[PDB]
Amino acid sequence: ATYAQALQSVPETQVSQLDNGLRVASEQSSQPTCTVGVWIDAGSRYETEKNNGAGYFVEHLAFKGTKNRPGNALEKEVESMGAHLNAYSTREHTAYYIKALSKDLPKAVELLADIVQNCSLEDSQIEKERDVILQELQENDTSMRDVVFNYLHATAFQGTPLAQSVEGPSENVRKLSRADLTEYLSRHYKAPRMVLAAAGGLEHRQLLDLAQKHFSGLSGTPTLTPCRFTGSEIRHREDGLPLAHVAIAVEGPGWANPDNVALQVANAIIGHYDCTYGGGMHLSSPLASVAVTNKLCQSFQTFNICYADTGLLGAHFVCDHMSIDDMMFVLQGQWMRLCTSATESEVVRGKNLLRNALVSHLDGTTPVCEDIGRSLLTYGRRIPLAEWESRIAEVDARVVREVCSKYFYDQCPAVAGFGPIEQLPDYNRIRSGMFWLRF
Amino acid sequence: SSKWLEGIRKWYYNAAGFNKLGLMRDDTIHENDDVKEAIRRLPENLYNDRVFRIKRALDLSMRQQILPKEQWTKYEEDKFYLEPYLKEVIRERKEREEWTK
């Protein structure tokens, strides 16, 4: 069929509210599965100065023991019922989810609610997890990419606590004390900030009743404040590295604007080309044809990060140290061509690719359940596919060049360079070439 | 008719010049991006025959002397070897142009 008939058949994301600050979201579907997750909006953005990254310390210390159900017994029961327990964390949020079958849901809500409300600290285990965090900072200095992105956030938001790093300094790691971590647990992870999601071929009312059972008596009853986008530069001269990693970003809109929808169309236009794609020369985006014809970059991802009505909008390119300035110039030329001489065919192609990418995204257990999570983080609801289809159809080329002139033209970026990056010119060259004076 | 056009083509070939200097049709072409692309798409032995005939012609123009009478590669054995490749090159160039219109 077509868009109306297919987009009409989509489940409504049956929401409900548990009456202490809990938002529960079920998506009854037609496949035999369940994915059950707890999202608590707790990251470095909510954190203080002298407890930078203690939520990461929590998501290490979370599974290793509670007051009613022990830690080895926890993962033992996970392996007993055939589940897939998993957890992650941003600078703002925190997620603990379980991939299982829907009959394993009562044991799931059991163990996961004990994880929510009755965690603990074990001092020998806390020294062992301190050593684990040291070893993992050691083994995650290796991959250059999130080093570049943490580096980029730290130079983009200077002085403000929004660029508190994800794991703090090392001396901060070796002094996150027991009383301060229990204080962190008592302050943050409790009432107003939690979404309990359940996606699959499941039921709403029985899960509602058993969540009313397990979340009985939370007793939880000033944060999330804005910050400054400075705009700056940092360069790591380190010539013992094989390739060059350079990212540049401007201030992004956030969540609650159609500007974010127009910039999602723009980041569908530009994207992330990666070099190992089958065929490189004849790609539709002219940036792709140029950067492959002159063989400049090794990759580039050109994208948007949306924090709570704030955030970043930008690009990271990986290239050899002889193709920095040409890559930089053609990237700026693509941005200013979207600004000043925005045509129609590029908006058509960006809308086709953004529709196809979002439809191919919203499938499977983990992406749809994380869509439920990241929807109910700030939206106050979950947005279905039809409303994003409408807000894609509501933008023509004129609004696209309005948004690009609104955000990109003649700005103060944030540049993070990493590696053999000597050929990158000085910052005022990027400033005076960032806006077109028509060369 | 057909006897008229072939006689004209033979007269213009005998008075053209490149029969004297030991070349063919495709030897005397002017080169742009498309023609150099078509040269790049050539078979190897035909490419080597092409560069040997070109170097003989540059020799003949160097001492300003023509090959003798029978050593002229005459009409109706001229090799139109670059014809389908360059034909497809110009066709695909027009395809790119009318796609990017």
């Binding site: 000043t340 002139s405 033209y409 077109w436 004076l437 028509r438 | -």
Partner: protein, 55 residues
């Protein structure tokens, strides 16, 4: 005052060139008149325009 000025005269390059040329002509006007006025005001007395006024 400032954001209105950036909105009007500092978006594209041709408008910036036009407004600096128009500013140059208005500066020509006011600057020539003020310069000649102050110059002949500090040289009042034995300047030629007094004698042209008499004669």
């Amino acid at each position: 005052l400032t954001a209105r000025l950036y909105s009007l005269l500092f978006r594209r390059t041709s408008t910036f060139a036009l407004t600096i040329v128009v500013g140059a002509l208005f500066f020509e006007r006011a600057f020539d008149q003020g310069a000649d006025a102050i110059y002949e005001h500090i040289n009042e007395g034995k300047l030629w325009k007094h004698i042209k006024h008499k004669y």
